[PDB]
Design a protein around this nucleic acid. Structure first.
Lengths: 127, 98, 96, 151, 114, 79, 206
RNA sequence: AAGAACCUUACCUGGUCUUGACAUCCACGGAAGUUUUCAGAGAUGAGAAUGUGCCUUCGGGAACCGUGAGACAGGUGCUGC
RNA sequence: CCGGCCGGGAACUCAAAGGAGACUGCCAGUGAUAAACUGGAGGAAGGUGGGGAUGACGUCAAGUCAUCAUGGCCCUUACGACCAGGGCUACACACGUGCUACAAUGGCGCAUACAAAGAGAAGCGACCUCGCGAGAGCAAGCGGACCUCAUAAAGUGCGUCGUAGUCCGGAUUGGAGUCUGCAACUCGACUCCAUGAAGUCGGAAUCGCUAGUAAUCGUGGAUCAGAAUGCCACGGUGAAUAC
């Protein structure tokens, strides 16, 4: 199979053409180093990109669609999980034990009537 | 090439109407592309329940306008003859292009 | 109740939409200069109710100024009543 | 939490060193949800603290954290005269968390302009046992020994 | 560079002292910034006479300094002489640009007087 | 702050102001419409703005040209 | 004061919409007011015919109105002359060509609009409210519904202090949305005040 | 109040009332309307020009307009105890 | 044309119809052989999965006769009704809500990213030209997954500011475009250029919130010729602590 982008997190969906090769991340035919290579928090979004530990020999071209940056990272990670179960099912148990096969269903709670935010209530005067 | 945009407030009426049009094209025997769904327009109205005073207690309404486009490949004269009051459902508005 | 405002709103609707909205629009585009003024004076000599500024868009079964919604065409209380009774097609309560 | 307490969320390791402790330091230090700025200030301070100390980043943080961990801490139980403070042993997560909190406020109390630099300064102060976070630790310990109630 | 004012550049920007002199705004400051095109945070030693002359001609071409006191003075004075309330309500000192003074406009009214 | 396509004048005021200028012998001109920019033709006249049942007469001068008619006229009273 | 309209909470779930048409944002209000003028006229014109529900369907050229009635004979008139005069006046109210169908309401005591206007007519005729409510719940419980709640309210029997007296039989599950409850009100315009009658009838769980 | 420059919009000046801004009749005349002049802050008037088409078993019926007395209106006036 | 743009394909994101799944279902312990509780396997989701709509008999004679309808009372050549203008926008002070902040976890300047929801026919308005700018003129595509509103904002990579009253922004009459021309004086906003007050984190007290929540960062709606930091929705990063 060709290992591809699967899965969702926040408001994202993964489109990674991950393939055997030296892993240098290219986004929209442009480099990590041109886009945000020396950005801080790039490393801590790229660590869930690596956290499936099948990135050590895999070249990454990442054009994950939609949503914020950490959600895009979770979509990429979930895609490598689902593609590696599509490759071989013995390592399903170890991704389950580490806790990466779980999609994080946490999402933005809605605004509400008589209230500024999802839970945030007007400041109440006792008098 | 016949481009029929049929829109209603109820999805059961929508599915009945689009199955009728697909049935008409199937009865005349032409290549039919599937009825695609176009996204529902959730028009939300937030309306005060109390006649005199409230701000926290208020109820919200929605009108949902559904949309499918059938986009049949081949129209024909037998279908043009058979179009006369073929839809026959008051809930659905149908829009036509050539 | 409030029949004076009903006939006042009917008055500004008929004075804006029917007698005018062509004479006023032509005088407006004459008033903006394209390359004391006659268009400003003549738009003054037109009656003031002809202006679409004047119309307060108001409820049809009652006449409440506020809580009017243009799409339904009635006051807030009346669209609640017709929604809960089923007169308005497709109007269901929102719960997302 | 009358019914049931909820267990804490599983904390991710930091990317550079694989430390849930350093990640908890990051999560405590952030404001307005700014993890990028928080961990950058952390890395800059850990680099400067490590080059002044001559030891590694996590070990310098560990020695400084060990100096900001209290052993005893009071708790208002009102056992005497309806207003009394009782010294109680503090569990290791609350030791490390109170260390990190007293540190990040000790950074905020230090008058240096850039918070990465003052963050390394009272890290070095805790490693030599003279900063205001360890002052808070001494005040907490002196209050425990002052109002000793139960073992 | 001191022209018709009290403020002077001192190892800092000309534009802050220029906008501190009343009678102008900061579009003169932005225009002098665009005319120079250099870093004005550098030392004011070897302050250029070209900068002094461009500053002077920009002030002279636009509204010259000292005209704010001039404008408020003739406004209050001509309506006080003619007896009308427009300059009187500027003398009273409350906002008449359209602003609420019911509990706001403490910047005009000063400290609160019980 | 206001339009540059034309300086607005009330048409009844324009007629009565040019008639007052042409005659040269006039009383105060009573006007309820306070929203008129003063023309240079108006200099040499008192034009009365509407305040209350009472009278506010304004002798408009050379300076009071760009300002509207009601700026000089107080609608509210205070201590 | 605090209870939801049952038809509104069951509008997409169980109960059907009363008017079925599609108009855009430019013609929706104009159609709605046309429906109201037709509905108001036909209600105030055949309140003596005991009409229960009026459904108006517009295919955006014509108007089709169905009147759900217990007594079809007085709605029709003789030879359809009354219903044809109705068809003509509905045509000039709607402004578009018209059509009337008559669908009959079997078991009139199970229809809440008919019970509400029956109790309203008796309360105008100074029959006592307690006899009206006991008659309503007893007749429904005989006729075969699973339950009935009758609320009468305000100025009962010519007392200065208004009161709300409710009489309930069977199961009336308002909170359950799968249940069908037809709820309808009526307004009796008495001498001392106005007496308002609210009836819920529970027929089954759909 | 999910929109105070007028409008909205009730509290201060001018103008109007037995049909009033707003419907129903009874009686008489005129198509409805369009375009203008002048006075005035202006619905207010005072004047002018063109349209009597739509039709009635024409013993003239229209959606309509103007006027007159009556019934009648009307009220964001009070009492939510 | 290295823009899926173009053939193709329907493989996936999706758009939207119908199903499945989550039931203490299984295992172990506790508990009475019950309910249940506590862990574990499976699994995207675990024990109301999250949120919402749903507000029982009643209570306050709570609110509305100003939404309407309505009983009684009153005005009716006025307590009906029209116009101009004015007030609802004032101001010795006091609290209730929210916004801008007192900076360096921040400004300021260049470059570079990643969303969701909604609206649109007198309505949305691209591209080009003219303007520092608000905007002007020319003006395609659109009653809609097309087109337009609309190259979001924090995040950034380098620099510079390293007490600065700081782009934190107050303050009359201007210099202005734009809205309706009854008309931006009493009275809209907008880069407004208008003098850069105060506040160097705030006393007694007090308020909102157990996980995508708090906090922070931006966006759209309705009212509407215009006129929000209010109300009604939507997205990003992302806490700490419950002994």
């Amino acid at each position: 199979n060709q290992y591809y982008g699967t899965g969702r997190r926040k408001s994202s969906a993964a489109r990674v053409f991950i393939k055997p090769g030296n892993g240098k991340i290219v986004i929209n035919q442009r480099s990590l180093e041109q886009y945000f290579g020396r950005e801080t928090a790039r490393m801590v979004v790229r660590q869930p990109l690596e956290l499936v530990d099948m990135v050590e020999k895999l070249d990454l071209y990442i054009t994950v669609k939609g949503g914020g940056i950490s959600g895009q990272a979770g979509a990429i990670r979930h895609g490598i999980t689902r593609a590696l179960m599509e490759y071989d099912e013995s390592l399903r148990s170890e991704l389950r034990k580490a806790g990466f096969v779980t999609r994080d269903a946490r999402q933005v709670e809605r605004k509400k009537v008589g209230l500024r935010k999802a839970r945030r209530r007007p400041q109440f005067s006792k008098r | 090439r016949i481009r029929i945009r049929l829109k209603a407030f109820d999805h059961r009426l929508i599915d009945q109407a689009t199955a009728e049009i697909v049935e008409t094209a199937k009865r005349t025997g032409a290549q039919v592309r599937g009825p695609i769904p176009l996204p529902t327009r959730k028009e939300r109205f937030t309306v005060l329940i109390s006649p005199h005073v409230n701000k926290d207690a208020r109820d919200q309404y929605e009108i949902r306008t559904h949309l499918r486009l059938v986009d049949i490949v081949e129209p024909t004269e037998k279908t043009v003859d058979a179009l006369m009051r073929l839809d026959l459902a008051a809930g659905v508005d149908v829009q036509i292009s050539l | 109740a409030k029949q004076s405002m009903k006939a006042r709103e009917v008055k500004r609707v008929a004075l804006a939409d029917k007698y005018f909205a062509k004479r006023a629009e032509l005088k407006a585009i004459i008033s903006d200069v394209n390359a004391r003024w006659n268009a400003v004076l003549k738009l003054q000599t037109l009656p003031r109710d002809s202006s679409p500024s004047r119309q307060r868009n108001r409820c049809r079964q009652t006449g409440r100024p506020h809580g009017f919604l243009r799409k339904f065409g009635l006051s807030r209380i009346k669209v609640r009543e017709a929604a809960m009774r089923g007169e308005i097609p497709g109007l269901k309560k929102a719960s997302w | 939490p009358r019914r049931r307490v909820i267990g804490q969320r599983k904390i991710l390791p930091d990317p550079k060193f694989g430390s849930e402790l350093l990640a908890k330091f990051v999560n405590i230090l952030m404001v307005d949800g700014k993890k990028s700025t928080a961990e950058s200030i952390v890395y800059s301070a850990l680099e400067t603290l490590a080059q002044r100390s001559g030891k590694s980043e996590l070990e310098a943080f560990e020695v400084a954290l060990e100096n900001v961990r209290p052993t005893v801490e009071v708790k208002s139980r009102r056992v005497g005269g309806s207003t009394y403070q009782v010294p109680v042993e503090v569990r290791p997560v609350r030791r490390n968390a109170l260390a990190m909190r007293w540190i990040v406020e000790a950074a905020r109390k230090r008058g240096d302009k850039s918070m990465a630099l003052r963050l390394a300064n009272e890290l070095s102060d805790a490693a030599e046992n003279k900063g205001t976070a360890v002052k808070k630790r001494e005040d907490v310990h002196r209050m425990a020994e002052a109002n000793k109630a139960f073992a | 560079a001191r022209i018709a004012g009290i403020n002077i550049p001192d190892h800092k920007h000309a534009v802050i002292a220029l906008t501190s002199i009343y009678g102008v705004g900061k579009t003169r400051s932005k225009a002098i910034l665009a005319a120079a095109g250099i870093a004005e945070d550098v030392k004011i030693s070897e302050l250029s006479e070209g900068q002094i002359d461009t500053l002077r001609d920009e002030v002279a071409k636009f509204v010259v300094e000292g005209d704010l006191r001039r404008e408020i003075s003739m406004s209050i004075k001509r309506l006080m002489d003619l007896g009308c309330y427009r300059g009187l309500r500027h003398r009273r000192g409350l906002p008449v640009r359209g602003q609420r003074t019911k509990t706001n406009a403490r910047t005009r009214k000063g400290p609160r007087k019980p | 702050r206001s339009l540059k396509k034309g300086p607005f004048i009330d048409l009844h005021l324009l007629k009565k102001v040019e008639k007052a200028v042409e005659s040269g012998d006039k009383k105060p001109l009573r006007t309820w419409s306070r929203r008129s920019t003063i023309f240079p033709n108006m200099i040499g006249l008192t034009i009365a703005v509407h305040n209350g049942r009472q009278h506010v007469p304004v002798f408009v001068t050379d300076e009071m040209v760009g300002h509207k008619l009601g700026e000089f006229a107080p609608t509210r009273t205070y201590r | 004061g605090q209870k939801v309209h049952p038809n509104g909470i069951r509008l997409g779930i169980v109960k059907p919409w009363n008017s079925t048409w599609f108009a855009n944002t430019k013609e929706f209000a104009d159609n709605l007011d046309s429906d109201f003028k037709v509905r108001q006229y036909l209600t105030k014109e055949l309140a003596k015919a005991s009409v229960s529900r009026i459904v108006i369907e517009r295919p955006a050229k014509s108007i089709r109105v169905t009147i759900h009635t217990a007594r079809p004979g007085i709605v029709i008139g003789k030879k359809g002359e009354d219903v044809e005069k109705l068809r003509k006046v509905v045509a000039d109210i709607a402004g578009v060509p018209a059509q009337i169908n008559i669908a009959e309401v079997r078991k009139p005591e199970l229809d809440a609009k008919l019970v509400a206007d029956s109790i309203t007519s008796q309360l105008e005729r100074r029959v006592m409210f307690r006899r009206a409510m006991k008659r309503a719940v007893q007749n429904a419980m005989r006729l075969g519904a699973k339950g009935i709640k009758v609320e009468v309210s305000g100025r009962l029997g010519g007392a200065e202090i208004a009161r709300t007296e409710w009489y309930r039989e069977g199961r009336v599950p308002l909170h359950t949305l799968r249940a069908d409850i037809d709820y309808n009100t009526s307004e009796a315009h008495t001498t001392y005040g106005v007496i308002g009658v609210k009836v819920w009838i529970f027929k089954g769980e759909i």
